[PDB]
């Protein structure tokens, strides 16, 4: 499956969301180059205004583009599941606020790597940091800690994202993740390791729709 990632691969992302009954959709396009762990993406809210802050969607909106060091390549579950792909599920607990539950299918459609997502958010506070849009449009960076899940023939992960709040404080988002192959072929069940991930958020000065530009680097480490 790793052979499918040796060059630059087009990416498409499609998300339908419902957070406390606020419905929305997001589409994204860009490119990934796993040789360098490099992702360039642009997302648009296709339904109008996004009802949650963009930074809170970054993690949900393709870890198959991680750069695995040569000495770690037998620990890359993500690429091993391709082209058939994998289901990626999360619960994201926003401290003192609501939660997102996400289910996504990541697979090739031809030469394009597609991430199709449903997101459901509940128990958010109307005037909290998410629905109240109190988070800075700021980068996120952290380590995704992966372990094998032999019983789903896949992986689990956990990590924290600390989103800056406009008052100088932090909104914690505790992520719990599980990935399961879609196909029935052999996949790589890894030893414990992590993905060092950094996402830089920006705006396209010519884009009038509600949107997010991302430049992201993802590198496997810890072995």
Q: For strand 9-19 and strand 170-181, is the pairing parallel, antiparallel, or unpaired? A: unpaired
* Structure determination method: X-ray
Cβ burial of 48 (10 Å; 0-12, 13-18, 19+) is exposed
Between CA 69 and CA 73 the distance in angstroms is 6
Closest CA to 87 of 4, 173, 218, 187: 187
51 close to 19: Cβ distance less than 8 angstroms: yes
Q: Which residues contact 150 (CB under 8 A, 6 or more apart)?
A: 189
Beta strands in the chain (DSSP E): 9-19, 22-33, 38-45, 86-94, 99-109, 112-122, 140-149, 154-164, 170-181, 193-202, 211-221
Say whether the peptide bond before residue 83 is cis (omega within 30 degrees of 0).
yes
Secondary structure of residue 77 in the 3-state scheme = helix
Between CA 142 and CA 218 the distance in angstroms is 10
What is the separation, in whole angstroms, between the first and last Cα of the chain?
A: 21
Helix locations, the chain, DSSP H = 77-80
**How many Cβ atoms are within 10 Å of 58's Cβ, its own excluded?**
21
CATH number of 1-223: 2.40.155.10
Resolution of the experimental model in angstroms, please? 1.1
Please count the residues of the chain.
Answer: 223
Query: Where in the chain are the domains?
Result: 1-223
Q: After which residues is the chain broken (C to N over 2.5 A)?
A: 61
């Amino acid at each position: 499956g790793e052979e499918l990632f040796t060059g630059v691969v087009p990416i498409l992302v499609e998300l339908d969301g419902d957070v406390n009954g606020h419905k929305f959709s997001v589409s994204g396009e860009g490119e990934g180059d796993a040789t360098y762990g490099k992702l360039t993406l642009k997302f648009i809210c296709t339904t109008g205004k996004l009802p949650v802050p963009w930074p809170t969607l970054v993690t949900t909106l393709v870890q198959c583009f991680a750069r695995y060091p040569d000495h770690m390549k037998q620990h890359d579950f993500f690429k091993s599941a391709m082209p058939e792909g994998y289901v990626q599920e999360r619960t994201i607990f926003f401290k003192d606020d609501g939660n997102y539950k996400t289910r996504a299918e990541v697979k090739f459609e031809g030469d394009t790597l597609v991430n199709r997502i449903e997101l459901k958010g509940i128990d958010f506070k109307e005037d909290g940091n998410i629905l109240g849009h109190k988070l800075e449009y700021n980068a996120i960076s952290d380590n995704v800690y992966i372990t094998a899940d032999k019983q789903k023939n896949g992986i689990k992960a956990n990590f924290k994202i600390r989103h800056n709040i406009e008052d100088g404080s932090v909104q914690l988002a505790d992520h719990y993740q599980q990935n399961t192959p879609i196909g029935d072929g052999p996949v790589l069940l890894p030893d414990n390791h992590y993905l060092s991930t950094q996402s830089a958020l920006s705006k396209d000065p010519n884009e009038k729709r509600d949107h997010m530009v991302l430049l992201e680097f993802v590198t496997a480490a810890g072995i």
